[PDB]
Write a protein that binds this ligand. Structure first.
Ligand SMILES: *[C@@H]1O[C@H](CO)[C@@H](O[C@@H]2O[C@H](CO)[C@@H](O[C@@H]3O[C@H](CO)[C@@H](O)[C@H](O)[C@@H]3O)[C@H](O)[C@H]2NC(C)=O)[C@H](O)[C@H]1NC(C)=O
Ligand SMILES: *[C@@H]1O[C@H](CO)[C@@H](O[C@@H]2O[C@H](CO)[C@@H](O[C@@H]3O[C@H](CO)[C@@H](O)[C@H](O)[C@@H]3O)[C@H](O)[C@H]2NC(C)=O)[C@H](O)[C@H]1NC(C)=O
Ligand code: NAG
Ligand code: NAG
Lengths: 61, 61
């Protein structure tokens, strides 16, 4: 996972083939080592396209 | 997939590294051999966190 100046993309480690990140690539490993990317839940969709928080949207809608 | 007395977790088979189950680990293989876990669709979220049934929630909301 890397950063092309405000745009996050995912590529391999052997060849350079960029694409966009999707939800099926992430797991959940509780408690957050320090050297991660600080981001709140509201702006998470700017990292992962095609991720809609059902909870907060049904709070709104 | 195992059970720590009402809490379901997923670990490897070589080392013991527990975490929570997510949606990207399951496939759909129709007709249900006998020795599974009997559970209805309403309480499925107690097995899989971050699984919202869109259909029944839009029936409600
Ligand atoms: C994401 O945000 C968190 C919190 O806003 C950052 O965690 C904290 O970061 C500081 C420095 O990056 C860690 O060092 C501390 O610095 C102070 C001096 O201001 C010093 O007095 C402390 O003894 C300590 O050395 C701090 O430990 C850390 N907080 C915790 C609870 O570990 C985090 O660094 C941010 N992410 C990135 C990539 O910067
Ligand atoms: C999940 O629930 C289903 C249905 O509620 C269970 O399926 C049925 O389980 C019984 C015993 O576990 C199976 O054996 C049957 O027992 C009766 C005696 O009560 C006997 O007369 C029958 O000939 C048969 O041996 C039954 O076959 C099975 N139903 C079907 C359609 O196969 C299931 O066992 C439950 N899951 C677990 C893990 O227990
Ligand atoms: C999920 O969403 C519903 C309604 O949007 C809300 O009542 C519930 O508290 C939310 N749960 C979490 C863990 O965000
Ligand atoms: C999916 O949800 C919609 C509205 O919530 C409903 O009309 C439809 O029957 C549902 N389909 C299934 C297969 O549950």
């Amino acid at each position: 996972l890397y950063s092309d100046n405000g745009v996050f993309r995912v590529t391999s480690r052997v060849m350079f083939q960029p694409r966009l990140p999707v939800l099926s690539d992430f797991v959940q490993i509780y408690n957050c080592n320090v050297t991660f990317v600080n981001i709140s839940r509201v702006e998470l969709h700017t990292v992962i396209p095609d991720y809609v928080d059902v909870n907060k949207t049904l709070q709104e809608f």
